[PDB]
Amino acid sequence: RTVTVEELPIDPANVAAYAAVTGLRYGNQVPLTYPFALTFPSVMSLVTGFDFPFAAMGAIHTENHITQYRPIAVTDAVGVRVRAENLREHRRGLLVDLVTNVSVGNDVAWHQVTTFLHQQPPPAAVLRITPAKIRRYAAVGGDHNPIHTNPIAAKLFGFPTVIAHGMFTAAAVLANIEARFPDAVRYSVRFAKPVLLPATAGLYVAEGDGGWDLTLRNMAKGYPHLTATVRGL
Ligand SMILES: [Mg+2]
């Protein structure tokens, strides 16, 4: 239950296209969330190879914790390690933790815990999220889970329309604030109601220190799509 890549190259053109579609800045270091996408093929090879029943197609992303110890340069080639751990019963199904460590040289730069489920007032910003943009996020980020792109498959897996990738939303909400993030930062997200597409969602931001609290809501109905914290280390 362990995957390794010794020297994964970074494609800057992909980093640019990731920043464009999520609304983040393309600079010399990759966005804080970008290594989710970079290591995604490595995570899915672990998930798809689970001995027991657990399907990547139609899987649900419930929670995500990123710890960045140091930025990763767009020119870096990276070491990747993934392990899967903490199978639990939930209610809606099987939960599992996928734990990824991304290294530059001998050092761990970026550390993530991803939790998946197999089913068994005026805002500080506004996000417009269309099916087209998410079709584009799926191409660029490489998560082709069809609940985000194929309506017929979304229905089959329980949703009335296609939904946004949780990690699209988790990237997009950092747009304004990311320029003030320190190099060492932790970002914790709890996904709630899926974002049904197309949608216009409002982001609420408080400065609960030394950092930020975030809540993304559906604008008509007001229910939460996610809550998150950003903190310096
Ligand atoms: Mg996260």
CATH number of 190's domain = 3.10.129.10
**CB-count burial class (<10 Å; 0-12, 13-18, 19+) for 177:** middle
Q: Which two tokens stand for residue 113?
A: 């815990």
Output the CA 109–ligand 1 centroid distance in Å. 15
Output the CA 131–ligand 1 centroid distance in Å. 23
Output the CA 86–ligand 1 centroid distance in Å. 18
Output the CA 157–ligand 1 centroid distance in Å. 24
Output the CA 197–ligand 1 centroid distance in Å. 22
Output the CA 187–ligand 1 centroid distance in Å. 5
Output the CA 191–ligand 1 centroid distance in Å. 10
Output the CA 190–ligand 1 centroid distance in Å. 8
Output the CA 166–ligand 1 centroid distance in Å. 10
Q: Which domain range does residue 98 map to?
A: 1-233
Output the CA 154–ligand 1 centroid distance in Å. 24
| Contact status, residue 155 vs residue 130, Cβ threshold 8 Å | no
Output the CA 65–ligand 1 centroid distance in Å. 4
Sequence letter at residue 83: R
Q: Which residues contact 73 (CB under 8 A, 6 or more apart)?
A: 28, 29, 30, 104
Output the CA 64–ligand 1 centroid distance in Å. 4
The per-residue b/e assignment along 10-31, b for 16 or more CB within 10 angstroms, e otherwise, is beeebbebbbebbbbeeeebbb
Split into its structural domains, the chain has a count of 1
Output the CA 38–ligand 1 centroid distance in Å. 14
The greatest distance separating any two alpha carbons of the chain, rounded to the nearest whole angstrom, comes to 49
Nearest one of 21, 14, 71 to 172, comparing CA atoms: 21
